């Protein structure tokens, strides 16, 4: 679970 | 309209329930967790969705968007269902069904 | 979300959109496995609502989006409709979601986990961007 | 509206629904004549949104409704984004509403009118019936 | 869902702005009017719609649904744009356009 | 204005 195959990009 | 079309995201800090109660008082219960008051806010239509936090390289569901500012103010904390207080019930429901 | 940003398409693969019987998005939710979605009890979900998985743009029409029927709603009986406490409901799908790059599950915490005040987390959704 | 009741269809003939370009209802409004609608500034209406007149049941396809394009948006320049004061926007329609038994205008007050505390008034709309 | 397909209505009482400040404090401004806190409440999706009062056999637009309780609480008054405070601007816009 | 052809029932 919890590990997207398409990584999210966070600005923060 | 102020509808987005594409899925939005925001980073925001968890608050302690003591600090959350500075704003919201006795509306804050133990099965709630607050987040935000940092310049971002959940708003109408976000309800039900996730508040996730990274732990051991993976995202874990810490909150469920529940309720918050009347006007989606970014200086007031958002209130989320505290998943740790409800996950025993989740796990029991999945095991029996 | 006010003062958020557009997520990378498909990068929150557990995020689902809950649509009523008219096709209207009314709430979000999160896949916890291929058969179950967790959402808020105050959303008032029923088995005439639909779980939409794999979506990012609400105006797009694509067979690559999964519209999943709900077999049964499990509202936590401790939900308080006045205080909004215990605001959680589980949705059991009629047919399992097909996991892929854009559709998968979020992890669940244990009841003993500590998510400290000050930790930076993320929230996602299709809510208003301005009140 | 929480703890309201169903209206008699067509009995609030100035009531419109504002839909975004995807067809999603996002706000109400009121016809004030065949060419103009008044709504809230916080709705964020733009010229890609559509005014729906004559509607009762959003799930029906047998009602005589009108989908009106918006030519110009006039957001009150005194609207305050923080306090939400002066929360009003006018919509000038591209093509006029066709008035009928179910589509017609509300009256406007004068700036000197007094609507006393305790007066029983009415509000209408398609908002949630429970949080 | 809690979305009504059919148009809803509710009767509710107007408040004075000073009595509305009992609930909302300094958030109540001159171009606002409150109504409710009587067992009914405007709620998500009602925004922009009318608050009408009967005068001389006809209905007059007194308020525009503006903002209110975080959870649509029926013991808290809703806040409406006060049309009398904004109608000279409305009339000026109509007369010039 | 303000006089619905279909009277409301409140």
C45: distance to nearest CA of chain E, Å? 5
In this structure, is the dihedral angle defined by the CA atoms of residues C51, C58, D87 and B12, taken in order, positive or negative?
A: positive
Residue C92 CB partners (closer than 8 Å, separation 6+)? B97, C35, C36, C70, C71, C72, C73, C74
* Number of domains forming the structure of chain B: 1
In whole angstroms, give the CA distance from residue D6 to residue D10.
11
How many CB atoms lie under 10 A from the CB of residue B75? Answer: 12
Q: Which residue range is the domain that position E22 belongs to?
A: 1-97
Question: Does residue B17 sit in helix, strand or coil?
Answer: helix
Residue with tokens 């806040």: E79
Residues D1-131, CATH architecture: Beta Barrel (2.40)
Q: How many angstroms away from the CA of B56 is the closest CA of chain A?
A: 10
Solved with = X-ray
Q: What is the CA radius of gyration of chain B?
A: 14
Q: Burial letters for D35-72: b for 16+ Cβ neighbours within 10 Å, e otherwise?
A: bbbbbbbbbbbeeebbbbbbbbbbeeeeeebbebebee
Q: What is the CATH number of the domain that holds E43?
A: 2.40.10.10
Q: What's the gap in Å between the CA of D18 and the closest CA on chain E?
A: 9
Other CB atoms within a 10 A radius of the CB of residue C82 amount to: 10
Q: Active-site residue numbers of B?
A: 47
Closest CA to D34 of D18, D19, D54: D54
For F8, the closest chain E residue by CA position comes to E9
Nearest CB to D86 within list E14, E31, E62: E31
DSSP 8-state code for residue F6: S
Domain residue limits, chain C: 1-131
**Resolution of the experimental model, in Å, one decimal:** 1.3
CA atoms of D119 and B80, how far apart (whole Å):
38
Interface residue of D19, D24, D40 to substitute, partner C, most C CBs within 10 Å: D24
**Does the active-site annotation cover C25?**
no
- Specify the pairing of strand C15-19 against strand C5-6: unpaired
Stretch (H or E) spanning E96: helix E83-96
Q: Which single residue is written with the structure tokens 């998510």?
A: C115
Is residue F4 within 8 A of residue D104, CB to CB? The reply is yes
Question: Residue E8 in contact with residue D1, Cβ under 8 Å?
Answer: yes
The chains in contact with chain B, meaning 3 or more Cβ pairs closer than 8 Å, are A, C, D, E
The rounded distance, in Å, linking the Cα atoms of C59 and E75 is 37
- Please spell the DSSP secondary structure of D40-99, one letter per residue: -GGG---TTSEEEES-SBTT-SSS--EEEEEEEEEE-TT--TTT--S--EEEEESS----
Beta partners for residue D30, in sequence order: D15, D38
């Amino acid at each position: 679970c919890g590990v997207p195959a398409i990584q999210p990009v966070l600005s923060g | 309209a102020n509808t987005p079309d594409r899925l939005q995201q925001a980073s925001l800090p968890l608050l302690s329930n003591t600090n959350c109660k500075k704003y919201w008082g006795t509306k804050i219960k133990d099965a709630m967790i607050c987040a935000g008051a940092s310049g971002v806010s959940s708003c109408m239509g976000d309800s039900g969705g996730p508040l996730v936090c990274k732990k051991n390289g993976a995202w874990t569901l810490v909150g469920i968007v529940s309720w918050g500012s009347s006007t989606c103010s970014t200086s007031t904390p958002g209130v989320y269902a505290r998943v740790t207080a409800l996950v025993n019930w989740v796990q029991q429901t999945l095991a029996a069904n | 979300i006010v003062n958020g940003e557009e997520a990378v398409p498909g990068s929150w693969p557990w995020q689902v959109s809950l649509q009523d019987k008219t096709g209207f998005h009314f709430c979000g939710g999160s896949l916890i496995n291929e058969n179950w979605v967790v959402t808020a009890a105050h959303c008032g979900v029923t088995t005439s609502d639909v779980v939409v998985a794999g979506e990012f743009d609400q105006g797009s029409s694509s067979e690559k989006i999964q519209k999943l029927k709900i077999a049964k709603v499990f509202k936590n009986s401790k939900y308080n409709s006045l205080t909004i406490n215990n605001d959680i409901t589980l949705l059991k799908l009629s047919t399992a979601a097909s996991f892929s790059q854009t559709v998968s599950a979020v992890c669940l915490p244990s009841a003993s986990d500590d998510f400290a005040a000050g930790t930076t987390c993320v929230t996602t959704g299709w809510g208003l961007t301005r009140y």
